[PDB]
Structure 1
Amino acid sequence: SEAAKKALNDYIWGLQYDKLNILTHQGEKLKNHSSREAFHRPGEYVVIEKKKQSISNATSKLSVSSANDDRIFPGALLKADQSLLENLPTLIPVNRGKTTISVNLPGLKNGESNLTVENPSNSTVRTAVNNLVEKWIQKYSKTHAVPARMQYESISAQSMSQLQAKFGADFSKVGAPLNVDFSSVHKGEKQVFIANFRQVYYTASVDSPNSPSALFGSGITPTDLINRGVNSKTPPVYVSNVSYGRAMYVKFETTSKSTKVQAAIDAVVKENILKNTKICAVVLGGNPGEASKVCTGNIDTLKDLIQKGSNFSAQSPAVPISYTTSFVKDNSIATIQNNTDYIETKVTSYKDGALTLNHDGAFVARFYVYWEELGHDADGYETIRSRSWSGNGYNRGAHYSTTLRFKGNVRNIRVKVLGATPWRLIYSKNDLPLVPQRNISTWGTTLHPQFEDKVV
């Protein structure tokens, strides 16, 4: 009998495979698609640029949904097959051995934190984990307090497949109540952000087994594992940790075009600020009585939701929200990597600008200034017209001041400027950004010409 343990230990260790490669899901791969589209709006020239982007996200913390709830418990034996990447893992149907568990609730004394389950199953482990929690409650709920641990992840909406690579393939099911309208990001009227909050009170983590065989009960042989499909193509893994508490997916729908909208989000999880938007959230782990999906609310309503779950209420045992898998072979943490391409629509506005040239010196100055203007021909393709200022190539005097007013379709602004000591340079720049107002000046002595470049 003891020889069965040995033989089974060698089949698990004998497996050869590349960890950081089996847990890789490759979505669509698209060919590069750089494209543009331009409008003319009062006071601005705005661009709607559609590009091809790729996202690669690696995570060891997997979400827990109503679809996979029964299959997720400390010590569950799973296959690193296709189902795990869809976050709907399939349990290896096989007998099991003892599973030693530990809980990190505060105060835990001596071996009061360690459990053992003889015949691991969902019901058996939840009851055993829930039993311990109820103990810690009555005896330490009042004296000890457990602050929630936050893991916050956010992104901008650019494809449904893009979101599945950041939060997991199960986002389509869990996020359906969000009804992320996606047509109008490509149209360009709204800017949608998605965020994930994971509020962890306690985590149940399994002690590393003394041997791979320990995770299997009766005289299990290497053979019966091969029938169940346990091999290098699909090596075995076990749920190493399960996190209980609260987790929520929330959407933000904005119309502003600030490139710092992500900063306003981070600020509320503690860089522009003021903004009235619409919100819609779906919550898992709330305290029944008052919870569920909540559409409406303006940031402050949201900030209280992030706050209303800052602490374990202690009304009952928490619900699992996230878990982690590990390889049976070497007891390493399994990473899941999701890669894909997607069409990234972006809106960018160029305001109207102005450049003022001033000369207050007793010295002969000569200016040269050029730029380029984008336009649309009859067919509709983006054109280029190289243009220069009329006031270039002429002599300028003591009290000279002139204002050039550029529109938003202007790039590659060049400034040549020379005086007299023949002609002599005093300043030179290229591709000056189109600031609402920039003032170029000059003054001093012919022996010592001086100058200024300023912005407001």
Structure 2
Amino acid sequence: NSEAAKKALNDYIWGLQYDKLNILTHQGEKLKNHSSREAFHRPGEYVVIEKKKQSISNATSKLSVSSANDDRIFPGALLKADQSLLENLPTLIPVNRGKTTISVNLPGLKNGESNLTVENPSNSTVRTAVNNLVEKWIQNYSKTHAVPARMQYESISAQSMSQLQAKFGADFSKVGAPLNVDFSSVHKGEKQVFIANFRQVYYTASVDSPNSPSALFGSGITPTDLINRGVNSKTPPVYVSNVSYGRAMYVKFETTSKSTKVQAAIDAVVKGAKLKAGTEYENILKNTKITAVVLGGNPGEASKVITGNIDTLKDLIQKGSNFSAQSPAVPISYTTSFVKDNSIATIQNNTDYIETKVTSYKDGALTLNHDGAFVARFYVYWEELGHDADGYETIRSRSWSGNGYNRGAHYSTTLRFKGNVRNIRVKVLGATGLAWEPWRLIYSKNDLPLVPQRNISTWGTTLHPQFEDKVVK
């Protein structure tokens, strides 16, 4: 009678065949291979705006709550695994539901205080019940139990709107729009832009895995009811298994520096290494323009854009680092699981894009010192990137003017290289003052890095030739 209706639902859902870790895959642009560059001279450096084709392959289960999706996102909600979820605006399935057991992980809660049962789950019933649990928790436990955020952190180099959407979700186009990412500034090679998603999580409402597909729906629901509702193997059913509450922000970083490690620099701030002393990460973030849209803090803030420097961030991070407990926090991320096997669903976005790396190889110098009581002979070679009339890049093989002259005891000299030099090759020959062969490879080294200042010295005796290859920078 009832057993029969449930069973019929159970098998129908259990019956569905689909590629779990695949139907939730979005493909963006695909690009033809491409690798080009542009290099030029500017005092003290040779600059190279290099453009390559790259691909990003992003996989997430922790989906982000937005004002557009807000009303469909609540623990236990029935959605389809279709194009709408791929775009992060999932459609709820129009069907009577069954009891939903929900569990909130606020600390202090004991006995069955942490567990809720909602009769006819709707965005309304479930949110009321959840918040009412959170209102109880505040009055009773907030003064005695602290709630420090758990911080989810993702960041990336802004290259393309389509790449940002793979990393942050199709959503990102609108949610992030207030940040106005100037993509030409990256492509023109002037700026280096970054984007970070911060999710500061105070608490989560996790739904208990139901005893069977049947339990998610109302009594009297039928495989036919779901066939008609388009709940099938093309577009199988999922449920919101978790909803995380707190405060989240999207942040844009704008350097003019052309450094490598900016990402690791930003990563360093976030990650506990607060005020890194010395000199490296410090002297990069010093000149960074922080722009942040926040979500959770107040009601009416997806508006209020925040501007400042690296410090204006750390203060935004610390302001949300703990749960103030004035009132229930707002949803900021959720998870779906397939009804069939309760497995967390993963959204995957792949796309192709044009990366723009800007690089600077600075002027450097090479000091050769001979101090030994034997007859030395230096040999230095390298190549020189230039351009022709038509604009294409040229390679000129060059050698030192001092190649193979005999050097005496007090010798010294400095060859200065501009940034467009590469393949630096040093050979040194000392005299063994004998008949059958008179020179020996004292020191050879190919592909020498163009460091600001390198000393290659010599000394000792005709038997034991000494030498040192040291950087001074």
For normalisation by structure 2, the TM-score amounts to 0.94
Compared CA separation, residues 39 and 273, structure 1 to 2 (3 A): closer
Shift in Å, 1:81: 0.4
Residues 1:53 and 2:54 are matched in the alignment: yes
Shift in Å, 1:40: 0.7
Report the Cα distance in structure 2 between the residues aligned to 1:142 and 1:268, rounded to whole angstroms: 30
Q: Is the 8 A contact 1:263 1:272 kept in 2?
A: no
Shift in Å, 1:341: 0.8
Shift in Å, 1:262: 1.6
Report the Cα distance in structure 2 between the residues aligned to 1:385 and 1:289, rounded to whole angstroms: 62
Q: Is the 8 A contact 1:280 1:293 kept in 2?
A: no
Specify the SS of the correspondent of 1:110: coil
Q: Is the 8 A contact 1:286 1:292 kept in 2?
A: no
Shift in Å, 1:223: 1.6
Report the Cα distance in structure 2 between the residues aligned to 1:84 and 1:54, rounded to whole angstroms: 22
Q: Is the 8 A contact 2:293 2:301 kept in 1?
A: no
Q: Is the 8 A contact 1:205 1:241 kept in 2?
A: yes
Specify the SS of the correspondent of 2:447: coil
Q: Is the 8 A contact 2:199 2:247 kept in 1?
A: yes
Q: Is the 8 A contact 1:352 1:436 kept in 2?
A: yes
Q: Is the 8 A contact 1:81 1:234 kept in 2?
A: yes
Q: Is the 8 A contact 2:178 2:305 kept in 1?
A: no
Q: Is the 8 A contact 2:192 2:258 kept in 1?
A: yes
Residues 1:276 and 2:277 are matched in the alignment: no
Q: Deviations over 1:48-76 (max 9, x none)?
A: 00001111111110000000000000000
Compared CA separation, residues 259 and 295, structure 1 to 2 (3 A): same
Shift in Å, 1:437: 0.7
Compared CA separation, residues 232 and 282, structure 1 to 2 (3 A): same
Shift in Å, 1:359: 0.6
Q: Is the 8 A contact 1:264 1:272 kept in 2?
A: no
Q: Deviations over 1:103-131 (max 9, x none)?
A: 10001111111111111100010111111
Q: Is the 8 A contact 1:364 1:419 kept in 2?
A: yes
The partner residue of 1:433 within 444, 449, 465 is 449
Report the Cα distance in structure 1 between the residues aligned to 2:285 and 2:301, rounded to whole angstroms: 29
Report the Cα distance in structure 1 between the residues aligned to 2:298 and 2:145, rounded to whole angstroms: 20
Report the Cα distance in structure 1 between the residues aligned to 2:255 and 2:220, rounded to whole angstroms: 60
Match of 1:401 in 2: 412
Q: Is the 8 A contact 2:25 2:349 kept in 1?
A: yes
Shift in Å, 1:312: 1.4
Specify the SS of the correspondent of 1:273: helix
Report the Cα distance in structure 2 between the residues aligned to 1:423 and 1:197, rounded to whole angstroms: 64
Specify the SS of the correspondent of 2:285: coil
Compared CA separation, residues 2 and 291, structure 1 to 2 (3 A): closer
Report the Cα distance in structure 1 between the residues aligned to 2:60 and 2:124, rounded to whole angstroms: 28
Report the Cα distance in structure 2 between the residues aligned to 1:332 and 1:185, rounded to whole angstroms: 40
Shift in Å, 1:273: 5.1
Report the Cα distance in structure 1 between the residues aligned to 2:233 and 2:371, rounded to whole angstroms: 80
Q: Deviations over 1:294-353 (max 9, x none)?
A: 332122222111111111112111110000000111111111111111100110001111
Report the Cα distance in structure 1 between the residues aligned to 2:246 and 2:333, rounded to whole angstroms: 9
Q: Deviations over 1:19-59 (max 9, x none)?
A: 11111111111011100001110111110000011111111
Report the Cα distance in structure 1 between the residues aligned to 2:151 and 2:469, rounded to whole angstroms: 47
Match of 2:316 in 1: 305
Shift in Å, 1:277: 2.7
Report the Cα distance in structure 1 between the residues aligned to 2:113 and 2:215, rounded to whole angstroms: 22
Q: Is the 8 A contact 1:367 1:394 kept in 2?
A: yes
Q: Is the 8 A contact 2:290 2:312 kept in 1?
A: no
Report the Cα distance in structure 1 between the residues aligned to 2:45 and 2:373, rounded to whole angstroms: 38
Q: Deviations over 1:148-183 (max 9, x none)?
A: 110111111100001001111000110111111111
Shift in Å, 1:366: 1.4
Q: Is the 8 A contact 2:363 2:418 kept in 1?
A: yes
Q: Is the 8 A contact 1:356 1:404 kept in 2?
A: yes
Q: Deviations over 1:208-247 (max 9, x none)?
A: 1011100011221112211111111111100000011100
Match of 2:112 in 1: 111
Q: Is the 8 A contact 2:266 2:285 kept in 1?
A: no
Q: Is the 8 A contact 1:101 1:207 kept in 2?
A: yes
Report the Cα distance in structure 1 between the residues aligned to 2:301 and 2:115, rounded to whole angstroms: 34
Q: Is the 8 A contact 1:260 1:272 kept in 2?
A: no
Shift in Å, 1:276: 2.8
Match of 2:126 in 1: 125
The CA RMSD over aligned residues, in Å, is 1.3
Q: Is the 8 A contact 1:261 1:272 kept in 2?
A: no
Structure 1 residues not aligned, in runs of 5+: none
Compared CA separation, residues 89 and 274, structure 1 to 2 (3 A): closer
Deviates most, 297-306 or 83-92: 297-306
Report the Cα distance in structure 1 between the residues aligned to 2:420 and 2:284, rounded to whole angstroms: 29
Q: Is the 8 A contact 2:56 2:350 kept in 1?
A: yes
Match of 1:345 in 2: 356
Shift in Å, 1:184: 1.2
Q: Is the 8 A contact 1:43 1:351 kept in 2?
A: yes
Report the Cα distance in structure 1 between the residues aligned to 2:57 and 2:336, rounded to whole angstroms: 20
Shift in Å, 1:196: 0.8
Report the Cα distance in structure 1 between the residues aligned to 2:303 and 2:142, rounded to whole angstroms: 26
Alignment length (residue pairs): 455
Residues 1:286 and 2:286 are matched in the alignment: no
Q: Deviations over 1:227-278 (max 9, x none)?
A: 1111111111000000111000011111011112123312321x75551332
Specify the SS of the correspondent of 1:276: coil
Q: Is the 8 A contact 2:338 2:345 kept in 1?
A: yes
Compared CA separation, residues 289 and 36, structure 1 to 2 (3 A): closer
Report the Cα distance in structure 2 between the residues aligned to 1:345 and 1:300, rounded to whole angstroms: 28
Q: Is the 8 A contact 1:284 1:292 kept in 2?
A: no
Deviates most, 222-231 or 124-133: 222-231
Report the Cα distance in structure 2 between the residues aligned to 1:425 and 1:265, rounded to whole angstroms: 47
Shift in Å, 1:441: 0.9
Report the Cα distance in structure 2 between the residues aligned to 1:113 and 1:410, rounded to whole angstroms: 67
Specify the SS of the correspondent of 1:19: coil
Match of 1:315 in 2: 326
Report the Cα distance in structure 2 between the residues aligned to 1:82 and 1:14, rounded to whole angstroms: 22
Match of 2:400 in 1: 389
Deviates most, 273-282 or 20-29: 273-282
Specify the SS of the correspondent of 1:137: helix
Specify the SS of the correspondent of 1:40: strand
Deviates most, 310-319 or 59-68: 310-319
Deviates most, 297-306 or 281-290: 281-290
Q: Is the 8 A contact 1:29 1:340 kept in 2?
A: yes
Shift in Å, 1:291: 8.7
